[PDB]
Amino acid sequence: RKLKIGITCYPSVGGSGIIATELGKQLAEKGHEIHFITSSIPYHPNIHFHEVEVNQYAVFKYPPYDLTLASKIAEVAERENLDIIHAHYALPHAVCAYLAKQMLKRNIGIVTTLHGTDITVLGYDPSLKDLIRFAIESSDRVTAVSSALAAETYDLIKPEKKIETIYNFIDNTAAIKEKHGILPDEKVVIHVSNFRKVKRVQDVIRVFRNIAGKTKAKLLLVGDGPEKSTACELIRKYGLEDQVLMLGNQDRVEDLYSISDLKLLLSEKESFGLVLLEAMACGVPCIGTNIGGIPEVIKNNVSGFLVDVGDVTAATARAMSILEDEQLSNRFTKAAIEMLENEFSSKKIVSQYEQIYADLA
């Protein structure tokens, strides 16, 4: 049964944005009518974009994006007769969905997906606890991208609400290596992140120093963010400028995972770690920290390795085990691919979102 589904999110912060957009693309492919309600964007015929323009109107001291977004949700809900609004993030989107629902004369189902950013915000301003709780409680169905995010939510927010785990999902290496001046005999390590402190790039670099000081190696650092200059400085301090490619942000990140032999994600906080799936899909074995959602993706000594937060020497050892032992590497990669094709497959995950919409319609 074809539904009309509104989706309200920030179209791209890194991981979440990609997930919401991708999810909309896959529902479109299944014949559903999808209506993104977002800030202006720069596609399938069943996907439509509605833009929220915020103005100050010379009355408002701060631009009222929340209220403007609520308004626009309600307007679209009504004109297009939406069955669902799917909000990504409790704040602001789930509260806006709620406001839009109270404006509408019609009932409409609200689904909210927590990606982790409500926990982050709560760390900056714990007084938002009640508002986040309300937003969760006022949704019809609430999902989280990991069981560990869900548990953390229950712990800090304590809502009277079942939070269901629905995981994230994902959609010529000689030439690419050549483009990037990587030689046939260099081992390629990759790290993709938004360079925030919680990512601990400094740990990624200390591990890579250890690596490149044993075998011959190149590090691909992909992304941009606040701790970039901390990264460079540390690259220069250790003398690794020839051996590291600061690629900034990238498109064609699949090209970069395709040429890599090892993926490091050594975060102190991580609700899921979408970058792990992408590397797994490209047959790149992973080491991650044993926090947050990471151990729901990497199964230790089965699909990759897990290490303690900050444990550089343990991650080095794991890293070499993998870089030398082609047999270990291949068994990891193959175990990872099996996860992709079952638990993390877009077909299974899009159907779990879809079952929620049908429940509510």
Ligand X SMILES: CC(=O)N[C@H]1[C@@H](O[C@@H](CC(=O)O)C(=O)O)O[C@H](CO)[C@@H](O)[C@@H]1O
Ligand Y SMILES: O=c1ccn([C@@H]2O[C@H](COP(=O)(O)O)[C@@H](O)[C@H]2O)c(=O)[nH]1
Q: Which residues are annotated as a binding site?
A: 16, 89, 117, 194, 250, 278
Of 339, 297, 290, nearest to 15 by C-alpha is 297
Instruction: Look up tokens 């090892």; give the residue.
Output: 262
What is the SS3 assignment for 247?
Answer: coil
Does 253 contact ligand Y by CB under 6 A?
yes
Two tokens at 181? 């001046």
Name the site residues for ligand X (rule: CB under 6 A): 13-16, 19, 115-117, 120, 145, 168, 194, 196, 198, 269-274
Tokens for 271, please give them.
């609700």
Of 21, 40, 27, give the one whose Cα is nearest residue 84.
27
CB neighbour list of residue 82: distance below 8 Å, 6 or more residues apart: 4, 5, 6, 35, 76, 108
DSSP class of residue 54?
P
Pick the binder of ligand Y from 4, 5, 8, 15 (CB under 6 A).
Answer: 15
Taken as a whole, the chain contains a residue count of 361
Question: Within 13 A of 226's CA, how many CA atoms are on the CB side?
Answer: 5
Phi and psi torsions of 301, nearest 5°: 60, 25
Pick from 27, 37, 74, 262 the residue near a second copy by CB under 8 A.
74
CB-CB contact of 244 with 268 (8 Å): no
The footprint of ligand Y on this chain (CB under 6 A) covers a number of residues equal to: 14
For residue 194, the minimal CB distance to a second copy (Å) is 9
Please choose, out of 14-22, 38-46, 136-144, 341-349, the segment that lies near ligand Y by the rule CB under 6 A: 14-22
Of 98-106, 178-186, 247-255, 347-355, the window that binds a second copy (rule: CB under 8 A) is: 98-106
> x/- contact string, 113-152, with a second copy (CB under 8 A)?
----x--xx--xx-xx-xx--x---x--------------
* Alpha carbons 343 and 321: distance in angstroms, whole number: 27
Binding mask of the shown chain, residues 255 to 294, with x at each position contacting ligand Y by CB under 6 A: -----------------xxxx--x----------------
Q: Where does this chain bind ligand Y (CB under 6 A)?
A: 14-15, 18, 192, 222-223, 249-250, 253, 272-275, 278
Q: Where does this chain bind a second copy (CB under 8 A)?
A: 10, 13, 39, 53-55, 57-68, 70-72, 74-75, 89, 91-92, 95, 99, 102-103, 117, 120-121, 124-125, 127-128, 130-131, 134, 138, 196
